[PDB]
Design a protein around this ligand. Structure first.
Ligand SMILES: [Mg+2]
Ligand SMILES: [Mg+2]
Ligand SMILES: [Mg+2]
Ligand SMILES: [Mg+2]
Ligand SMILES: [Mg+2]
Ligand SMILES: [Mg+2]
Ligand SMILES: [Mg+2]
Ligand SMILES: [Mg+2]
Ligand SMILES: [Mg+2]
Ligand SMILES: [Mg+2]
Ligand SMILES: [Mg+2]
Ligand SMILES: [Mg+2]
Ligand SMILES: [Mg+2]
Ligand SMILES: [Mg+2]
Ligand SMILES: [Mg+2]
Ligand SMILES: [Mg+2]
Ligand SMILES: [Mg+2]
Ligand SMILES: [Mg+2]
Ligand SMILES: [Mg+2]
Ligand SMILES: [Mg+2]
Ligand SMILES: [Mg+2]
Ligand SMILES: [Mg+2]
Lengths: 102, 210, 46, 53, 147, 203
RNA sequence: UCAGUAACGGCGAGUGAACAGGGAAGAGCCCAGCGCCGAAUCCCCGCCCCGCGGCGGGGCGCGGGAAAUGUGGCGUACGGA
RNA sequence: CCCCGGCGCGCCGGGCCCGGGUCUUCCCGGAGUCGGGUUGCUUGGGAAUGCAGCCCAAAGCGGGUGGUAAACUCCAUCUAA
């Protein structure tokens, strides 16, 4: 058919050629590096876990995952931050099982 | 008290506004001072252009102004990179640099790249040591003609591509401008729910199938 | 005092190998230990 | 902050300059302004450009 | 000028034009818009219906550039191009119609008020009204959409 | 790379290691006077990333500020006003306790310039901050171009005009839609401009 | 200029910004950190030459000190080595 | 006619031994801070614009923002302490 660019609709906009360039280096901020992961895993060996993290893990051992999130969320503050935190502790608990199994 | 028909007015004079009145009786004296600092600056940097560094072209944001272009802050690193100008050398020879600005499309990128190349073609460059020219410097003949420039460098102007009269086709005559717009609004409004309904529909029948 | 001497002798040697040495500091030593370039690390107790 | 200054439309200000120039060429009006032009050769009085130097 | 104002004529007349009985007191009735729902209710109801109350949704952070959409009617459509543009098209024989780009003239939407001359034209705009497109089509023209 | 481990180590303030060190050090800090010259930065990593350098002319001070809000200092709690201004408790001070710590260090050592500060510990009653100060007349400071800025008379008592990092946090500065109060450089600057009547000659 | 506007408000009295646009002016940069360089860094003392009413420059001292709990060079998100 | 200043041209002794393009391998960040709860003030900022006290208390394809609270999900945009 005949079709025009339109100021409304799903394909709205004046048509231009998009140009692809490397992302600005400021956009990699907060990317984990193997050295910074190694340093954080070392501090985790020296220091350990916080009392709230340990209490969360006790909830996760008995498979109280829903209650574990609510405790974590109440302590860290946000759902997304808690979801990421619950996952790490479960990964830690999973690793401890494997190490014991070995 | 109100009196017959009248506008309801809410003047904002319930503070101590007289303590903070800014008269403008120094306006002509400000205008002279600003001009006198433009002249002493033009003399100070001559033959460099009085206006200042060359600025790029940029399209104004929002739908109210995107039909217009103007002078931006400075050329972007992608623009300078494509034009073979070192970013630290750009400011020394009258070119402005904007590390923040991103080039999203090619055409705008190319327009500033060409603007740079045109500017580099008009640049008359005086040797660092007057008696010892160097590789990139302008010849002594074209230094005798180097005169200061007034006004913005290579002024930016909104040019319109004129289209001549052409015979209207049956395809164009048949196009439905109103219907096309109204249907486009509907499609972009019901897209998300329609996709949801299609997904649920498949699930409902699949459980019947399996 | 004796690094000044070595440089002066280096000038005499010029006008006409690095021996092994300890490494001081927690910043220097930590980087060496991560690189596995240290054979023995001594840490003060206080 | 009494309003000392007044805006006058450019079109009117130019009008006022045309009225002044038109009036300046009529002996009756220039006489009636008190000027002693009873013996100037002509109105308007145009002299050669030498007097500019 | 103060020489043309009432004060000069009111010299010698006691009360200065505010009456002997009611006098000129400081603020009888209140200051500003006091009393709208009270001793001043008739004036507000009589002359400012709708003044009190709330209506319609709030919209935080309104940006008036988002709804920029200047409009032009069809009766003004041919002024956006020079005169010789129209006369040349009307008298030529090949049937070629001129292009009127209303965005270049600072308009986005084309409205239908008025009638067009019997002369084909190609119109470019972001938006059209339904009657604008019909009227534009009635003279042999076409509507072209731009983004 | 030791400064990386220390930075990460001090992020685990609830670990067993850190709890022991904070507890004992808060106890020690609590046996001294409220303003106390310190011999070296308690936190070499934190101090240096705030601008400190381990050279003559940089000095450290430890300040002890009482915790809690600002009680309105009115006799017998009477405010003599309207009910909206009857509050005596639950009121808060506009500036942080880190800022107040810098001001107390800054006022005491009037001949020194305050660079920055950091948190070293706290208990239920006291917050402890170490403040970095610079002697603007030592020659290790005046002759180094990178630090000649802080010797200028415009930088006298930065902590007392809300110019330090801690001090400038209560001023509501920043870019974007969240900080429209301080367009023009400051709240008063925004207010003056917005509350001044521009009467042009031709109006 | 947006704009007495979006908004706030016994939604009463009242209060009330910003983006975009046009101008004045126009300028950009530096650390910590990550690294590598024999601490390559700095202050003060005495003697010698120049200068000495903005106390500095150079040469010499197995002269003292700060500094490996980190000074200087390179380098900082536009990436850098 | 005096003085100060500025702008230029030469000599002595110093410092710097300096750059660009493409490949290859490497490195890259600010914590009792963010964010969350509550309280008080504050704002036009309205299920909370900013600030502060107290409590909780982070992460690293993370974090902040995207003007109506919240979950899932894409985008865009910056890179705080
Ligand atoms: Mg009346
Ligand atoms: Mg009236
Ligand atoms: Mg009478
Ligand atoms: Mg009377
Ligand atoms: Mg009267
Ligand atoms: Mg009366
Ligand atoms: Mg009155
Ligand atoms: Mg009150
Ligand atoms: Mg206050
Ligand atoms: Mg904060
Ligand atoms: Mg800032
Ligand atoms: Mg208006
Ligand atoms: Mg009411
Ligand atoms: Mg107010
Ligand atoms: Mg603006
Ligand atoms: Mg300008
Ligand atoms: Mg470094
Ligand atoms: Mg940046
Ligand atoms: Mg930063
Ligand atoms: Mg108050
Ligand atoms: Mg208020
Ligand atoms: Mg929303």
């Amino acid at each position: 058919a005949l079709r025009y660019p339109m100021a409304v609709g799903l394909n709205k906009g004046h048509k231009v050629t998009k140009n692809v360039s490397k992302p600005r280096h400021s956009r990699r901020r907060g990317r984990l590096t193997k050295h910074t992961k190694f340093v954080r895993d070392m501090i985790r060996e020296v220091c350990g876990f916080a009392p709230y993290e340990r209490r969360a893990m006790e909830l996760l051992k008995v498979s109280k995952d829903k209650r574990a999130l609510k405790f974590i969320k109440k302590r860290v503050g946000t759902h997304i931050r808690a979801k990421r935190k619950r996952e790490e502790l479960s990964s830690v608990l999973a690793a401890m099982r494997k190490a014991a199994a070995k | 008290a109100p009196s017959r028909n009248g506008m309801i007015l809410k003047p904002h004079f319930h503070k101590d506004w007289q303590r903070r009145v800014a008269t403008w009786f120094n306006q002509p004296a400000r205008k002279i001072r600003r001009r006198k600092a433009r002249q002493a600056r033009a003399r100070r940097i001559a033959p460099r252009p009085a206006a200042g560094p060359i600025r790029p072209i940029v399209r104004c944001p929002t739908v109210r102004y995107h039909t217009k272009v103007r002078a931006g802050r400075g050329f972007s690193l992608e623009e300078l990179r494509v034009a073979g100008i070192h970013k630290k050398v750009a400011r020394t020879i009258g070119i402005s640099v904007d590390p923040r600005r991103r080039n999203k499309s090619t055409e705008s990128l190319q327009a500033n790249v060409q603007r740079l190349k045109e500017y580099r073609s008009k640049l008359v460059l005086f040797p660092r040591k007057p008696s010892a020219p160097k590789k990139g410097d302008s010849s002594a003949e074209e230094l005798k003609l180097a005169t200061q420039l007034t006004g913005p460098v290579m002024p930016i102007r909104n040019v319109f591509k004129k289209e001549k009269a052409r015979v209207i086709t049956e395809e164009e005559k048949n196009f439905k401008a109103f219907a096309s717009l109204r249907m486009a609004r509907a499609n972009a409004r019901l897209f998300g729910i329609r996709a949801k309904r299609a997904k649920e529909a498949a699930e409902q029948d699949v459980e019947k199938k399996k | 005092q004796e690094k000044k001497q070595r440089l002066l002798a280096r000038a005499e040697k010029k006008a006409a190998k690095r021996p092994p040495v300890l490494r001081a500091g927690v910043n220097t030593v930590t980087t060496l230990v991560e690189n596995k370039k240290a054979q023995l690390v001594v840490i003060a107790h206080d | 902050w009494r309003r000392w200054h007044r805006r006058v439309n450019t079109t009117q200000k130019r009008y006022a300059i045309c009225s002044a120039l038109a009036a300046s060429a009529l002996p009756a009006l220039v006489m009636s302004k008190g000027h002693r032009i009873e013996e100037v050769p002509e109105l308007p009085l145009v002299v050669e450009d030498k007097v500019e130097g | 000028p103060s020489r043309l104002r009432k004060t000069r004529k009111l010299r010698g007349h006691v009360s200065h034009g505010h009456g002997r009985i009611g006098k000129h007191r400081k603020h009888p009735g209140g200051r500003g818009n006091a009393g709208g729902m009270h001793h001043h209710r008739i004036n507000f109801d009589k002359y400012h219906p709708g003044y009190f109350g709330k209506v319609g949704m709030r919209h935080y952070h309104l940006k008036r550039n988002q709804s920029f959409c200047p409009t032009v009617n069809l009766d003004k459509l041919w002024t956006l191009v020079s005169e010789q543009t129209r006369v040349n098209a009307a008298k030529n024989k090949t049937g070629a119609a001129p292009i009127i780009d209303v965005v270049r003239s600072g308009y986005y939407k084309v409205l239908g008020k008025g009638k067009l001359p019997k002369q084909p034209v190609i119109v470019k705009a972001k938006f059209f009204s339904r009657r604008a497109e019909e009227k534009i089509k009635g003279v042999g023209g076409a509507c072209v959409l731009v983004a | 790379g030791a400064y990386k481990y220390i930075q990460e180590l001090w992020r685990k303030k609830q670990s067993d290691v850190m709890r022991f060190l904070l507890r004992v050090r808060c106890w020690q800090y609590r046996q001294l006077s409220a303003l106390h010259r310190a011999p070296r930065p308690t936190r070499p990593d934190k101090a240096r990333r705030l601008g400190y350098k381990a050279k003559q002319g940089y000095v450290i001070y430890r300040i002890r500020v009482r915790r809690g809000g600002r009680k309105r200092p009115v006799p017998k709690g009477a405010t003599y006003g309207k009910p909206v201004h009857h509050g005596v408790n639950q009121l808060k001070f506009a500036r942080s306790l880190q800022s107040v710590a810098e001001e107390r260090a800054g006022r005491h050592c009037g001949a020194l310039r305050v660079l920055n500060s950091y948190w070293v510990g706290e208990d239920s009653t006291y917050k402890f901050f170490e403040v970095i100060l610079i002697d603007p007349f030592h020659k290790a400071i005046r002759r180094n171009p990178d630090t000649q800025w802080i010797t200028k008379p415009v930088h006298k008592h930065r902590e007392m005009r809300g110019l330090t990092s801690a001090g400038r946090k209560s001023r509501g500065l920043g870019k974007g839609h969240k900080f429209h109060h301080t367009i023009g450089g400051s709240r008063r600057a925004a207010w003056r401009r917005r509350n001044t009547l521009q009467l042009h000659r031709y109006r």
